[PDB]
Amino acid sequence: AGGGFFRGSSILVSGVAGAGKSSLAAHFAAAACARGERAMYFSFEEAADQA
Amino acid sequence: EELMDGWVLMLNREVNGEFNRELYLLKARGMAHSNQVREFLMSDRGISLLPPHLGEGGALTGTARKAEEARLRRAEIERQTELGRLQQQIEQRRRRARAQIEA
Amino acid sequence: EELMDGWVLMLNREVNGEFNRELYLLKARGMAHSNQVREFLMSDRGISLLPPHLGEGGALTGTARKAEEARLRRAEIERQTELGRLQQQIEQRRRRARAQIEA
Amino acid sequence: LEAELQAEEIALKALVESESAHERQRLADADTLARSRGNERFA
Ligand SMILES: Nc1ncnc2c1ncn2[C@@H]1O[C@H](COP(=O)(O)OP(=O)(O)OP(=O)(O)O)[C@@H](O)[C@H]1O
Numbered sequence: 343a344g345g346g347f348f349r350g351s352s353i354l355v356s357g358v359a360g361a362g363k364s365s366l367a368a369h370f371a372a373a374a375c376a377r378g379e380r381a382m383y384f385s386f387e388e389a390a391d392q393a
Numbered sequence: 394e395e396l397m398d399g400w401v402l403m404l405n406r407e408v409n410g411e412f413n414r415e416l417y418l419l420k421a422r423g424m425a426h427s428n429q430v431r432e433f434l435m436s437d438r439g440i441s442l443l444p445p446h447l448g449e450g451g452a453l454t455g456t457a458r459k460a461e462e463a464r465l466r467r468a469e470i471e472r473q474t475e476l477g478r479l480q481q482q483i484e485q486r487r488r489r490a491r492a493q494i495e496a
Numbered sequence: 497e498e499l500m501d502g503w504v505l506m507l508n509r510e511v512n513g514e515f516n517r518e519l520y521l522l523k524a525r526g527m528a529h530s531n532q533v534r535e536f537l538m539s540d541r542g543i544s545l546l547p548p549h550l551g552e553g554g555a556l557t558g559t560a561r562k563a564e565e566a567r568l569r570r571a572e573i574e575r576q577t578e579l580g581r582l583q584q585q586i587e588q589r590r591r592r593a594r595a596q597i598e599a
Numbered sequence: 600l601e602a603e604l605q606a607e608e609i610a611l612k613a614l615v616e617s618e619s620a621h622e623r624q625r626l627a628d629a630d631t632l633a634r635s636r637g638n639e640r641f642a
């Protein structure tokens with residue numbers, strides 16, 4: 343309800359390897375960027391080009 | 394997790410000799426949300442959730458869903474055949490009745 | 497595993513009093529891949545995957561797959577026999593009808 | 600008797616039509632499962 347999670351909240355994405363947690367995080371970041379807002383994606387697992 | 398406002402769990406389960414993807418909101422503070430384990434399927438267009446499962450035995454997913462749909466179609470079709478055969482039977486009885494009346 | 501780009505899991509399961517081999521790609525970064533637990537069988541020619549399981553109850557593997565195929569063949573054959581017997585029955589009714597007409 | 604014969608003819612034709620329809624539906628369901636578990640989605 344409401345169209346999405348409340349702004350400024352902490353959102354956890356849990357799952358086993360290969361579930362799609364990184365895909366969902368990338369979706370969030372891209373959606374935020376498409377609206378003209380800034381976004382940061384701290385990655386401790388992959389390089390920028392590989393991602 | 395003790396602090397998180399929202400929780401999204403993504404599952405990749407092995408059932409019926411094949412792997413199916415699903416996701417659900419374990420908790421969403423300060424709002425009401427769906428309580429369904431919505432199966433999704435990632436593709437070039439992005440992440441896309443399949444239409445909600447309708448009918449009894451909603452746990453079925455993947456090939457099992459198509460198999461259940463086919464089984465339902467077959468059974469309901471044969472029930473229709475049952476009713477049609479009974480109607481034809483009454484057809485036959487009425488034909489003899491009024492032909493006898495004609496004689 | 498936290499870093500691996502691709503993951504291939506090989507299973508050697510004991511089911512139905514016998515061991516069957518299978519393998520599946522747990523994850524393959526940056527591409528779409530099959531989500532089926534493909535049973536394979538190693539031999540002199542090398543590693544060879546069996547044709548995909550078709551039909552309901554795909555979990556069946558090894559001797560169980562052949563048994564299921566045989567059961568399906570038997571049941572569908574007997575359904576054919578059902579339909580043939582009904583056709584022969586209508587055969588008989590029509591024969592009496594037109595023989596009576598001849599008299 | 601001729602009325603009986605015509606009824607029987609209708610019954611035979613219903614038998615053929617419905618049986619062929621079952622054939623068609625079985626083929627369609629088999630194809631659907633074949634895609635659902637097929638690798639042709641990629642090549
Ligand atoms: N074009 C595509 N079509 C279908 N599935 C795809 C496609 N591209 C990627 N995938 C799926 O995405 C999966 C990887 O998703 P993702 O990287 O978001 O997972 P993850 O949970 O972050 O993984 P990890 O534990 O490795 O960090 C691949 O295993 C593949 O199954």
Ligand SMILES: [Mg+2]
Nearest residue numbers: 363364365387
């Ligand atoms: Mg990742």
